[PDB]
Amino acid sequence: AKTTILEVLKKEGKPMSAGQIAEKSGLERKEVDKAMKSLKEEELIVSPKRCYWTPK
Amino acid sequence: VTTAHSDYEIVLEGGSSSWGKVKARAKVNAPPASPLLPADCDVKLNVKPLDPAKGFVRISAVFESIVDSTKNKLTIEADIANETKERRISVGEGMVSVGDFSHTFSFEGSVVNLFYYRSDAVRRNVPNPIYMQGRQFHDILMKVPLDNNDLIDTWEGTVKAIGSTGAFNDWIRDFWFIGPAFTALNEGGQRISRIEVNGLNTESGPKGPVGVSRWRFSHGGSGMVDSISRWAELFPSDKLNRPAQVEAGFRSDSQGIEVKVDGEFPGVSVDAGGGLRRILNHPLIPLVHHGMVGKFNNFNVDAQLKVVLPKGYKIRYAAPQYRSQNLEEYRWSGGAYARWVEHVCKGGVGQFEILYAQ
Amino acid sequence: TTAHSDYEIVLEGGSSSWGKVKARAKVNAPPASPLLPADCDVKLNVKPLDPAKGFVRISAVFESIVDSTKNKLTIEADIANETKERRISVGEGMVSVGDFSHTFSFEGSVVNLFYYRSDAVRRNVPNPIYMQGRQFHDILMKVPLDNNDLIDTWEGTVKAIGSTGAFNDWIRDFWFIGPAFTALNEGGQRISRIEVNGLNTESGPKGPVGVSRWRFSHGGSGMVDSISRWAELFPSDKLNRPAQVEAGFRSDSQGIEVKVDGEFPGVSVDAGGGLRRILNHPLIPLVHHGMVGKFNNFNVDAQLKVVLPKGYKIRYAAPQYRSQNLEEYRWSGGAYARWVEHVCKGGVGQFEILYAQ
Amino acid sequence: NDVTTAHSDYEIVLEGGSSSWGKVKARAKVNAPPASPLLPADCDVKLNVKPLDPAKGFVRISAVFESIVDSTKNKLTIEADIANETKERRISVGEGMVSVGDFSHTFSFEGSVVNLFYYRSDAVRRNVPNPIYMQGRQFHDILMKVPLDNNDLIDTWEGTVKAIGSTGAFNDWIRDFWFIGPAFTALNEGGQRISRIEVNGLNTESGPKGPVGVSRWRFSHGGSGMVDSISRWAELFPSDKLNRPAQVEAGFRSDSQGIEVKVDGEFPGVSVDAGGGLRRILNHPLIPLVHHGMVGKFNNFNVDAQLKVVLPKGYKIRYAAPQYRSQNLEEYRWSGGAYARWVEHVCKGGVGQFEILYAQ
Amino acid sequence: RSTKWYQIFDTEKLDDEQVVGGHLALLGVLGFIMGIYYISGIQVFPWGAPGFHDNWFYLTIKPRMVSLGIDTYSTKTADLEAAGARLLGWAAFHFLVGSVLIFGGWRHWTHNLTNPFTGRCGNFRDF
Amino acid sequence: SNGKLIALAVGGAVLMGALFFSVSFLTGYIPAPNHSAILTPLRSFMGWFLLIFCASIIIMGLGKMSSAISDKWFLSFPLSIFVIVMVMFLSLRVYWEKGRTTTVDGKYIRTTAELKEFLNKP
Numbered sequence A: 001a002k003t004t005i006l007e008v009l010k011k012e013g014k015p016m017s018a019g020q021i022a023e024k025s026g027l028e029r030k031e032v033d034k035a036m037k038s039l040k041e042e043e044l045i046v047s048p049k050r051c052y053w054t055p056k
Numbered sequence B: 001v002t003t004a005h006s007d008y009e010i011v012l013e014g015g016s017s018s019w020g021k022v023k024a025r026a027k028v029n030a031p032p033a034s035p036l037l038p039a040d041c042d043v044k045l046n047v048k049p050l051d052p053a054k055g056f057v058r059i060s061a062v063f064e065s066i067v068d069s070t071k072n073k074l075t076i077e078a079d080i081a082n083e084t085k086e087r088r089i090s091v092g093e094g095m096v097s098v099g100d101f102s103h104t105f106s107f108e109g110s111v112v113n114l115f116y117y118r119s120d121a122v123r124r125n126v127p128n129p130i131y132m133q134g135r136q137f138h139d140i141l142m143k144v145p146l147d148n149n150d151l152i153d154t155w156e157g158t159v160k161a162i163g164s165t166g167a168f169n170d171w172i173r174d175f176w177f178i179g180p181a182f183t184a185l186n187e188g189g190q191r192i193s194r195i196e197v198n199g200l201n202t203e204s205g206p207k208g209p210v211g212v213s214r215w216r217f218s219h220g221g222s223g224m225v226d227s228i229s230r231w232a233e234l235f236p237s238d239k240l241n242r243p244a245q246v247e248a249g250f251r252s253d254s255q256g257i258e259v260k261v262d263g264e265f266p267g268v269s270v271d272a273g274g275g276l277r278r279i280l281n282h283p284l285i286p287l288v289h290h291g292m293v294g295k296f297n298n299f300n301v302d303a304q305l306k307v308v309l310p311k312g313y314k315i316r317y318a319a320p321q322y323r324s325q326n327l328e329e330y331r332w333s334g335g336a337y338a339r340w341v342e343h344v345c346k347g348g349v350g351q352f353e354i355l356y357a358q
Numbered sequence C: 001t002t003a004h005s006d007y008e009i010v011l012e013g014g015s016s017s018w019g020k021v022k023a024r025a026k027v028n029a030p031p032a033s034p035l036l037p038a039d040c041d042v043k044l045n046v047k048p049l050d051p052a053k054g055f056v057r058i059s060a061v062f063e064s065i066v067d068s069t070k071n072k073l074t075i076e077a078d079i080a081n082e083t084k085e086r087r088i089s090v091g092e093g094m095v096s097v098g099d100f101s102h103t104f105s106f107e108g109s110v111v112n113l114f115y116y117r118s119d120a121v122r123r124n125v126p127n128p129i130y131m132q133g134r135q136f137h138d139i140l141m142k143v144p145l146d147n148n149d150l151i152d153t154w155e156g157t158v159k160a161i162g163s164t165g166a167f168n169d170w171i172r173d174f175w176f177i178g179p180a181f182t183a184l185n186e187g188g189q190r191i192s193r194i195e196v197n198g199l200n201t202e203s204g205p206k207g208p209v210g211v212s213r214w215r216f217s218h219g220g221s222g223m224v225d226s227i228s229r230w231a232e233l234f235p236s237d238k239l240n241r242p243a244q245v246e247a248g249f250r251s252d253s254q255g256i257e258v259k260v261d262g263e264f265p266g267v268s269v270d271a272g273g274g275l276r277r278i279l280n281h282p283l284i285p286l287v288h289h290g291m292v293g294k295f296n297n298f299n300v301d302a303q304l305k306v307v308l309p310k311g312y313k314i315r316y317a318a319p320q321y322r323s324q325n326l327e328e329y330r331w332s333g334g335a336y337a338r339w340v341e342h343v344c345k346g347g348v349g350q351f352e353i354l355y356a357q
Numbered sequence D: 001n002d003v004t005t006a007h008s009d010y011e012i013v014l015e016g017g018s019s020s021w022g023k024v025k026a027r028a029k030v031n032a033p034p035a036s037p038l039l040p041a042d043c044d045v046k047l048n049v050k051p052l053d054p055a056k057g058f059v060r061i062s063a064v065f066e067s068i069v070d071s072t073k074n075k076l077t078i079e080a081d082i083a084n085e086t087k088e089r090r091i092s093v094g095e096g097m098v099s100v101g102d103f104s105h106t107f108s109f110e111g112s113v114v115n116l117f118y119y120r121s122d123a124v125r126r127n128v129p130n131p132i133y134m135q136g137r138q139f140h141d142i143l144m145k146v147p148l149d150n151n152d153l154i155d156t157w158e159g160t161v162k163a164i165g166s167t168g169a170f171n172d173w174i175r176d177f178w179f180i181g182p183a184f185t186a187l188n189e190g191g192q193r194i195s196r197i198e199v200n201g202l203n204t205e206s207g208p209k210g211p212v213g214v215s216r217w218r219f220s221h222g223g224s225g226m227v228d229s230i231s232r233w234a235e236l237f238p239s240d241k242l243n244r245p246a247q248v249e250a251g252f253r254s255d256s257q258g259i260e261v262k263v264d265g266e267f268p269g270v271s272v273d274a275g276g277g278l279r280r281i282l283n284h285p286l287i288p289l290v291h292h293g294m295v296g297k298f299n300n301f302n303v304d305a306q307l308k309v310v311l312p313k314g315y316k317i318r319y320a321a322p323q324y325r326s327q328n329l330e331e332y333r334w335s336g337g338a339y340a341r342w343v344e345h346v347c348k349g350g351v352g353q354f355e356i357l358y359a360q
Numbered sequence E: 001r002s003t004k005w006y007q008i009f010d011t012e013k014l015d016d017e018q019v020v021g022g023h024l025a026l027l028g029v030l031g032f033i034m035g036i037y038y039i040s041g042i043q044v045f046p047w048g049a050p051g052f053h054d055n056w057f058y059l060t061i062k063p064r065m066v067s068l069g070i071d072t073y074s075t076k077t078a079d080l081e082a083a084g085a086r087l088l089g090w091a092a093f094h095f096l097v098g099s100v101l102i103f104g105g106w107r108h109w110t111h112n113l114t115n116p117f118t119g120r121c122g123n124f125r126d127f
Numbered sequence F: 001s002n003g004k005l006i007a008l009a010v011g012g013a014v015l016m017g018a019l020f021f022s023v024s025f026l027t028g029y030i031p032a033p034n035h036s037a038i039l040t041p042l043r044s045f046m047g048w049f050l051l052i053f054c055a056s057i058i059i060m061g062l063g064k065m066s067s068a069i070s071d072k073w074f075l076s077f078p079l080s081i082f083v084i085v086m087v088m089f090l091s092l093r094v095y096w097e098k099g100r101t102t103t104v105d106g107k108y109i110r111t112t113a114e115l116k117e118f119l120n121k122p
């Protein structure tokens, strides 16, 4: 297939969505709230990665 | 870097059913070799057993392709049957359409394929007779209604040329192998005999004049020609007890090529010997004819083959060994298989022998 | 292994397709010649001679040095497209190899007949590439034989034609030496048996001149430029100025160096809708050089500069350009490098460049 | 990019003086699939030749091919007395036996081969020092007798006799029967134009073995100078230089994983006199290169090749294109740089020159 | 079958030069890890801030460092800062030399023994 | 379409969170000396999911590591671990344990003698 997930040494990551979700927001944790953003980013990073990551 | 990402899948059926779901996607960043681009095409091949008593299968092929800025379409629909073990008979119709032009045709051609040696000393000694030298004659009677003016003009031109040019029979050869075909032909071991035009006739039909042409030619194969050596293996009309489908296509631009293929058809599995089955011997004409395009860019393959055996079947041999096994699905990924993919994509005819048995 | 190439196209203004083409190439790969130290200094020239009849005077020189052997060939010609399918040339020239030298003169008529000229294909396909056809090629050659080698060669040719009736068939092996015969098959060409109308000889100002009126047929399946694009390769009408191409070439064990510099017309064509097209790439060069381009892997360092008449901006560059600075479009790397490797190794894919009026 | 390894070590041990003899060793390993649809493919070839009759021109050559393809054993033996009659003609009177699996049959043959160049120009020979492309044509006039002592043998003979006398196109299509597989491509890929054959005899008799089928056929094959069997006609068969039994043991063991090649043999003709006491290695035959190019272009590879030239005592190399890397006072070694480029060039089908000139 | 993911680097699939390259790349990796461990024993940075805590890696390899004078068993902050500077220098040396080792192992693994500064290649079989 | 797979998975996670919150309200518990009853159940559910998700992605990623591992990983596999390990060590200094743990004053207790002198404060 196209094999969108393209592992390379330049594999910083080039999906627009999961790229913007590569944010951490693990700082100012306030474990209930911003670590929930850590959870959200892990979810929305794995979901595209499992679907498709690098079309660029 | 010119990567080539491919994924192939072969789901099989148990027993003696040679039926297979063949799926295949591919994406190559190398430019295609078509002097006109972009080139897009979709090809459908649906065959159904029409009259099994006489061995007739109705096979319909639809090609729809955009080249540069022109749309082209070639539809055909023919009942084909095995008149004998060496002769095959086809009665069919079809049409071509290119932009602001189109014409239908009806044909009643017959194909007689016969080898040059049927010795039993070879059949009992070589269990895998890849090369089989032979000659395949075609006696083609085709009728075209000359509804359009250009059809009539070309009919008149052909009538003038055949009746005046003493070297039409051989120059037609390099006519109807347009461009690189006449090269690839010779690169596949295929020879073409000087045609004989048994007759041109303006036998008018019920709705206008009809150009009827009967001509006989013959193409000879040095064994690398699958249309000759694998003759009986090309036509699993015996195996066809239900409709068989193929839906392929490719989209090509200067950026690269994409290929899709999804089919359900027999002839995928053949008996190697002693209850042992085998994914059919790879045809060599596609490989050698691909070598005329596959040797133009240096590419790195990311290929993954997925042979899903029927419930209760095991692979007893794989020349490039399988990468992984999921108790019915055998996966080839990287390693020697990647080398073999790079080998065949560039025109190689190496053996990929998958032997499997219950 | 590296292949550094710099191309530079400078198109003339107005409807004229005149262009100056420069190409400096250096490849660190071994050539495919059984004699490696191969140098050439090709110099083709053409000037108008009679526009009333379209007669143009071509002057080509092919000085070369292969394995310390000086091989030079010069051709002067006066060529005209009389019928647009029949082209007639009267010319002369000389061939010299080492200490050997001999002159010749020729009168040649070439009739390029297409198999089909149907209007459906032309009106439906906007860019017809593969136009299969056949050239019927008649030549009257007048060669003075003022040397022992020429005399005994002429006698041997007469003896061979008088001895074997397969001379017409077997001369093709002698005619395309080395892999040239294969270049007929890879390039889609097919040369028919020659037809000798007479091997005469006449008294001349100095000794005898041998006269050979021989005719053959070169068919093309469409991949042949000389067959498909017979009309567009000889723009005698567009020759408003002298044209000149100089191609220097060097090859040793280390690598190959190519140096092309040529002002000529026909480097652009009409495509309809007011958009001119950088001409379709000839197919024979690519598929004949691919017979040697597959012998080594290489890294592409190619750069193409396209200089156009001002205001004639490019549209639909496929592959796309990299840098544009006011009529200097630049291709370097990316899909262009892939296409350069494609055509170097034998590919004939399209590099479609259109520029507006 | 990903490429396959190709290791190779070649050695040419040369003798000095008028002796053009040479030992040739060659080991090669390729981590690339072969182009054989029948795999695995093992093969061992043993060519042994001896001077049968000095002062008469007759040598005896013994070729022993053996192979194991797809678990099928094949073996050809040929023992032929060959002699150059004239400059352009030679004669071979020989016997042999082919075998495949259980089947096997013997044969005998008498064959006159003429090799006529298309020109005899003194202008070319006075100027060109390396006449590589010497176009011409070879005419074989082979007569051959086979003892038909098998049901399959007699069936094949019956089919042949009923085919030749039935279809007049037999002489044209016998070639596409005769060059099996991709060999037909290799006909023209090397410039070799095999011509329509002429069956001059299809008789049979009763010999000591029973029914014997005798067939005489003449066939001409041309060459555009790329055919080493034509241009190098007087250099490929040095009967005069064979004062000692020469041997060549070649073989390969091509599995799906790769190809292992082993060659070891001594024979003359390795060196020719380029003039002025400047000996040289013979011009590389181009047919093997262009024919191997069909298979060598299928995979991209990096090659490490070690060419060793063991010159005789007191012999100095004068020019080598590409240049030698290390001399060791007799063992001129090529490896890497431009020589690796040349090895890739020829292993992919190139015909580039390697002009080793050496003089005492 | 030798295609299991734990048989990928099997000896049958590797040449002597490939093994050379693998060992050199692993030794450069080893130097990088050694630098990491060294900079894991820098109790007080020369920058002038509290540094890494103790780990079993560095506490394992610390007696050797003291034996070699690189580290110290002194409580004085200035001397510990100087020894941390020594550790940083040795770790940087390890990082650079291990990078060179990984580079050489890559070249041997890729069968490309060509000098970046000179176009002259080299023969693994004859050097 | 894998969109429905992710939709079902995220819906299941959201439903787990909502159920945890609802039952936390149902189950009568004194929240804490300081913490609330709105955030603590969500903190516990974050731990729950993050654990399950981390284990699942580790399993899946290591499976695909075993699937995709080849010789071409010669530098991709080792160096990656190197960097991650490097990152880990740096994460120990800058994020987890920021310093050497000197006293509030900053006396750098580093020998057992001064530890004995310290633990016996007057």
Ligand code: BCL
Binding pocket: B022, B043, B047, B057, B059, B080, B226, B227, B230, B233, B234, B235, B236, B237, B240, B244, B246, B248, B261, B263, B265, B266, B267, B268, B280, B281, B282, B283
């Ligand atoms: C008129 C043409 C002939 C014919 C010609 C050939 C030739 C020639 C070959 C086959 C091959 C095969 N054919 Mg068939 N085939 C015929 C009728 C049939 C019928 C039938 C009962 O009608 C069936 C079931 C099959 C099925 C099969 C399989 C036995 C086999 C491919 C197996 C594989 O895995 O495919 C995998 C399939 C895919 C990769 C999909 C390919 C899809 C494309 C669109 C089809 C090829 C198009 C080609 C490149 C373009 C040609 C266009 C023309 C110019 C118009 N053919 C008709 C009568 N067939 C090959 C084989 O293996 O022989 C042993 C082979 O060599």
Ligand code: BCL
Binding pocket: C044, C045, C046, C058, C060, C075, C076, C077, C078, C079, C080, C087, C088, C089, C091, C106, C107, C108, C109, C110, C135, C138, C139, C218, C226, C230, C233, C234, C243, C244, C245, C263, C264
């Ligand atoms: C190459 C493919 C075809 C071919 C196609 C053509 C075409 C097309 C033409 C001829 C023409 C001629 N051909 Mg021819 N011809 C071929 C093989 C042959 C052979 C042979 C040895 O087999 C012979 C003896 C001839 C003989 C001849 C002459 C009778 C005649 C005039 C020669 C001329 O002046 O040359 C001068 C020679 C040179 C200029 C050398 C370089 C030739 C190359 C092909 C030029 C490429 C153009 C270059 C890219 C740009 C040039 C710009 C300059 C400013 C001009 N041809 C093959 C089979 N032939 C012409 C004609 O018909 O005359 C009436 C003509 O238009």
Ligand code: BCL
Binding pocket: C021, C042, C044, C046, C056, C058, C079, C225, C226, C229, C232, C233, C234, C235, C236, C239, C243, C245, C247, C260, C262, C264, C265, C266, C267, C279, C282, C284
């Ligand atoms: C005798 C030969 C024929 C002829 C045969 C051909 C053939 C065949 C071709 C052309 C091609 C072209 N020719 Mg012309 N052409 C002739 C007469 C002319 C005249 C003229 C007024 O006399 C002119 C101006 C041109 C000009 C041109 C262009 C329209 C075009 C190249 C465009 C390009 O970008 O070039 C870029 C130019 C460079 C890359 C420089 C190349 C320089 C080399 C030295 C030329 C090729 C030499 C060849 C490899 C070796 C010849 C060996 C022979 C044995 C001598 N030709 C004569 C009559 N011409 C090509 C074209 O586009 O066809 C549609 C083409 O394929």
Ligand code: BCL
Binding pocket: D047, D048, D049, D061, D062, D063, D078, D079, D080, D082, D083, D090, D091, D092, D094, D110, D111, D112, D113, D138, D140, D142, D221, D229, D236, D237, D246, D247, D248, D266, D267
């Ligand atoms: C290969 C290209 C040409 C060819 C070119 C030649 C050449 C050149 C010669 C012959 C010779 C012969 N050819 Mg022939 N011939 C070909 C095809 C054929 C075919 C066929 C396949 O149908 C037949 C029946 C023949 C028939 C014959 C015989 C009449 C004769 C001796 C055969 C034999 O004993 O060789 C013995 C066979 C072996 C030695 C096996 C290996 C053959 C290879 C080519 C030799 C490689 C030598 C190696 C590089 C150096 C090794 C050193 C050793 C010490 C010898 N040829 C093709 C078309 N033929 C000879 C002759 O003219 O006899 C009068 C001769 O000199």
Ligand code: BCL
Binding pocket: D024, D045, D047, D049, D059, D061, D082, D228, D229, D232, D235, D236, D237, D238, D239, D242, D246, D248, D250, D263, D267, D268, D269, D270, D282, D283, D284, D285
């Ligand atoms: C019947 C066959 C012909 C013949 C056909 C050819 C042809 C054709 C060629 C040679 C070549 C050579 N032959 Mg001879 N050869 C004949 C008899 C001889 C005799 C002899 C006195 O009988 C001798 C000493 C030689 C020796 C030689 C050398 C002069 C030269 C190779 C030099 C080199 O370094 O090789 C290095 C050798 C090796 C690499 C060993 C290769 C081992 C294999 C087994 C031999 C090639 C086999 C081929 C690939 C497969 C044949 C399969 C067929 C189906 C039978 N041949 C007979 C009469 N020989 C070549 C040469 O350069 O000519 C000038 C050449 O072109």
Ligand code: BCL
Binding pocket: E009, E010, E011, E014, E018, E019, E021, E022, E023, E025, E026, E029, E033, F073, F074, F075, F077, F078, F081, F082, F085
């Ligand atoms: C020094 C004592 C041992 C020795 C120790 C090792 C060790 C230890 C290793 C090898 C490895 C290899 N050995 Mg050893 N080796 C020895 C002698 C030999 C000899 C010989 C005598 O000729 C041979 C033929 C080999 C053969 C080989 C190859 C199979 C392989 C190197 C190629 C490659 O893939 O590397 C590159 C290999 C890798 C890319 C894969 C392994 C990557 C590792 C897991 C990355 C770890 C990074 C880092 C440590 C992470 C931080 C962790 C924290 C420290 C906690 N060894 C001696 C006898 N060898 C390595 C290999 O993988 O073997 C299969 C390996 O692990």
Ligand code: BCL
Binding pocket: E027, E028, E030, E031, E032, E034, E061, E062, E064, E065, E068, E090, E093, E094, E095, E097, E098, E101
């Ligand atoms: C090798 C790949 C890595 C590397 C990885 C390591 C590892 C791993 C460690 C060190 C450690 C050290 N490294 Mg270091 N190091 C490398 C390059 C260097 C270089 C340099 C010249 O570039 C230098 C000066 C140093 C310096 C040092 C010291 C600070 C320290 C102690 C070394 C010493 O005792 O070795 C003494 C070495 C010699 C005596 C050379 C001979 C070693 C013998 C052969 C070891 C095997 C013995 C065993 C019994 C087997 C024998 C088998 C046969 C019978 C012979 N490294 C590269 C970057 N470095 C050590 C550490 O931190 O200690 C806590 C440590 O263990």
Ligand code: BCL
Binding pocket: E020, E024, E100, E101, E102, E103, E104, E105, E107, E113, E114, E115, E116, E120, E121, E122, E123, E124, E125, E126, E127
């Ligand atoms: C990181 C250092 C690596 C390494 C990385 C490189 C690099 C990088 C290059 C080579 C090149 C070559 N190496 Mg090394 N190589 C190593 C060890 C070896 C080993 C081995 C492991 O057994 C072998 C078989 C070789 C063999 C070879 C040659 C084929 C080639 C030099 C040709 C010659 O004439 O050069 C004459 C000198 C050589 C034989 C010396 C080669 C080894 C090194 C450079 C010096 C000795 C080792 C020393 C203790 C450590 C210094 C390393 C430096 C920090 C780089 N090296 C060391 C341990 N190798 C070089 C090249 O091709 O040169 C033209 C090159 O550029």
Ligand SMILES: CCCCCCCCCCCC(=O)OC[C@H]1O[C@H](OC(C)(C)CCC\C(C)=C/C=C/C(C)=C/C=C/C(C)=C/C=C/C=C(C)/C=C/C=C(C)/C=C/c2c(C)ccc(C)c2C)[C@H](O)[C@@H](O)[C@@H]1O
Binding pocket: F009, F016, F019, F023, F051, F052, F053, F055, F056, F059, F060, F061, F063, F064, F067
């Ligand atoms: C240890 C962590 C778990 C990891 C276990 C691994 C699972 C199998 C994984 C395969 C194992 C294997 O072998 O291969 C690994 C292969 O991986 C990869 O493939 C993939 C398929 C892509 C992996 C992804 C699978 C999946 C998305 C991930 C896993 C699935 C997930 C989402 C797991 C979690 C599911 C959930 C959360 C389960 C629980 C959900 C249900 C619950 C909690 C019920 C609630 C009850 C309700 C209704 C109310 C309760 C109630 C009652 C009763 C009374 C009163 C009151 C008040 C109340 C509230 C590569 O491709 C291959 O290379 C590799 O090989």
Ligand SMILES: CC(C)=CCC/C(C)=C/C=C/C(C)=C/C=C/C(C)=C/C=C/C=C(C)/C=C/C=C(C)/C=C/c1c(C)ccc(C)c1C
Binding pocket: E023, E026, E027, E030
């Ligand atoms: C010519 C001939 C015959 C050849 C002779 C040529 C010679 C002499 C040989 C060269 C031999 C040489 C010099 C070769 C040297 C090779 C080296 C140094 C490779 C080291 C690999 C490290 C590995 C496998 C990683 C293991 C990782 C693990 C699991 C660690 C797990 C772990 C532990 C333990 C604790 C905590 C945590 C968190 C983890 C994760």
